[PDB]
């Protein structure tokens, strides 16, 4: 039995006036499989906000987002817990339609985090919009990805800059597993392969 549930995104409905996913509203994202709208994750989330009587966000609460397989708008991650290495909360995210875009341009924006990898292993389609992955000092693996395998339209481009240098990434052994194809990876594990060179019983090669 497969259960689905659609929830409004940030800037819409119950969260018309919310700046970001916070400790208050994240409870309401429980059981959501699909986000009609956008996701913003901003520094205020973890900092808290007196003005709106919002406590700081507990990083464990981001596990609530693991049910989300689809975002019809855009995904914006401008903050993340420092003691986490990937976007684990979105490990089951499959589609970003980019019907609404950030600044009318980006459907996926990962900016200024201390993550080492993306971890978006279930991601298979970005229907529209560009992808910016910028300012992540410790981020590897991002340059390896075959983004044409994920895009929907020919005009979709990519702005991947100011992350960890491919020099350091390769030197630190932070590269794609040997089982991975040349299509890149979301991380060092065999489950992080975009596709497999030989065979795969499922996610793992």
């Amino acid at each position: 039995l497969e259960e689905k549930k659609v929830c409004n995104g940030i800037g819409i409905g119950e969260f018309k006036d919310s700046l970001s996913i916070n400790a208050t509203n994240i409870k309401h994202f429980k059981n959501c499989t699909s986000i009609s709208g956008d996701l913003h994750i901003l520094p205020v989330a973890f900092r808290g906000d007196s003005f709106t009587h919002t406590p700081p966000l507990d990083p464990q609460e981001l596990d609530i987002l693991k049910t989300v397989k689809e975002i019809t708008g855009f995904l914006l991650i401008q903050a993340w817990p420092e003691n986490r290495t990937d976007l684990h909360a979105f490990e089951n995210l499959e589609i970003i339609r980019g019907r609404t875009k950030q600044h009318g341009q980006f459907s996926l924006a990962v900016v200024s985090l201390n993550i080492t990898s993306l971890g978006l292993r279930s991601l298979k389609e970005i229907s529209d919009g560009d992808v910016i992955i910028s300012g992540n000092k410790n981020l590897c693996y991002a340059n390896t990805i075959n983004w044409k395998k994920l895009f929907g339209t020919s005009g979709q481009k990519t702005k991947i800059i100011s992350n960890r240098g491919e020099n350091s990434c390769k030197a630190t052994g932070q590269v794609c597993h040997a089982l991975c194809s040349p299509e890149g990876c979301w991380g060092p594990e065999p489950r992080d392969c975009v596709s497999c060179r030989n065979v795969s019983r499922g996610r793992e090669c």
Partner: nanobody
Amino acid sequence: QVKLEESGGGSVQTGGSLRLTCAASGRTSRSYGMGWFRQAPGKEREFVSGISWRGDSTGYADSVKGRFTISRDNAKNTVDLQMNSLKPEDTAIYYCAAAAGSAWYGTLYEYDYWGQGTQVTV
């Protein structure tokens, strides 16, 4: 949400003054810390100045001590940056940023909104 537009940039004579402005649009009627940042070619983005919501507290990078001045008119919903005694080291794209709450911060990791930025060449 909030949108910020930077205005006031351009080219300057080496040693000349200049005044950047940043206008905010949207749900602007709440506590925001505002800050100015910049990014030089081939360099990383760095902190320049910041100001609290009430206007009382401010902060400046060491490289701009004495020269620059920050100010805001919350009625007009703006925040400006005087930049006297400019120098070719100050040549960069300058961004206006916002952090929800009263405080300003000296790093970029705390700011929630960003403008598109204006080029400043000296």
